[PDB]
Amino acid sequence: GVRKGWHEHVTQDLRSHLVHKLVQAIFPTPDPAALKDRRMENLVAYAKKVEGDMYESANSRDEYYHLLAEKIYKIQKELEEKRRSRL
């Protein structure tokens, strides 16, 4: 019947741009060798599972843009703690 003003500004392509931000959090810097790494295989599928969970969290394209920052933000700084996990 009806639905939130969701699709208004998410679009199919424009939405793909946001998905990359989720993957950049775990790996901001470029890594041509990572693409060959089996670990990367999980990165894609992983983001695909969470992204769907991140998108739904928003009842509007606006909220979706905010929650996205928190995820990438927390994960962005979290990378620092992971480095000291072995020193």
């Binding site: 810097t29 890594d31 992983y46 969970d53 990378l79 992971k82 480095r83 996990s85």
Partner: peptide, 19 residues
């Protein structure tokens, strides 16, 4: 729905090792 993330820590560990 969801729970604790295990691979999430392994994914970051990969990038954490290199630059």
């Amino acid at each position: 729905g969801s729970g604790t993330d295990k691979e999430l820590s392994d994914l970051l560990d990969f990038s954490a090792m290199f630059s």
